[PDB]
Amino acid sequence: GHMKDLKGTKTAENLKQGFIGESMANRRYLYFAKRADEEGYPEIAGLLRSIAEGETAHAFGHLDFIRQGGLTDPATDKPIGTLEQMIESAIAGETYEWTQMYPGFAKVAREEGFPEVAEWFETLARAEKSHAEKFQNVLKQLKG
C-alpha cells in the first residue's frame, strides 16, 4: 500500500499482536461495563465504555498500518486492501469457523462431558455458516 513495505519485519508481527490485544480489550471492557450497569455504577460503566472507544481507535490504527504496509488480516492471513478483499477475508474466517473450528470445539466439549457448552458451539457453527453465506451473496453483488 501507501507506506514502506512491512513484510518480513518484527514490526509486522507486533502490529498483529497489538491488533489481537486491542480487539480483546474492547470486548472485555464492554462486558465489564454491563456488570457495572447491573450493580448501579454508571460513572464506572461510562468510563469503561469511553476507554473501549480508545481501544477501537487503537485497533483500527493497527489495521491502517497493516493495510498500508502490505500485510494481511491478523485473523485470516488474507489481504484487506480493497472492499472486495475485505469481504473475501470475512468469508475465509467464517468458513474456517463453521467447517472446522466450532464443530471441533463442540465434539471436544461433548467428549469432556460439557454438553451445554457443546450446544453453544453447535449454535455458533450454524451462525458462522449463515454469516459466510450472507457475505458470499455480497461478494457476488460486488463482482457484478
Residues of this chain, 21-60, that bind Fe ion according to CB under 5 A: 22, 55, 58
Site for a second copy in 67-86 (CB under 8 A): 69, 73-75, 80, 83, 86
> Which residue has 472507544 as its cell numbers?
53
Map the footprint of Cl ion across residues 18-47, applying CB under 5 A: 41, 43-44
Residue 86 near which of a second copy, Fe ion, Cl ion, none (CB within 5-8 Å, type-dependent)? a second copy
Residue 100 interacts, among Fe ion, a second copy, Cl ion, none and using kind-specific CB cut-offs from 5 to 8 Å, with: none
- Give residue 108's region: left, alpha or beta (phi > 0; psi -120 to 50): alpha
Contact 143, 84 (CB under 8 A): yes
Burial class (CB in 10 A: 0-12, 13-18, 19+), 31: exposed
Question: Annotated binding residue at 2?
Answer: no
Alpha helix stretches (DSSP H) within the chain: 10-39, 42-68, 83-96, 102-111, 115-143
Report the distance separating Cα 60 and Cα 77, nearest Å: 17
- Annotated binding residues for Fe(3+), as ranges? 22, 55, 58, 94, 97, 128, 131
- Annotated binding residues for Mn(2+), as ranges? 22, 55, 58, 94, 128, 131
User: Which residues of the shown chain bind Cl ion in the complex (CB under 5 A)?
Assistant: 41, 43-44
User: Which residues of the shown chain bind Fe ion in the complex (CB under 5 A)?
Assistant: 22, 55, 58, 94, 128, 131
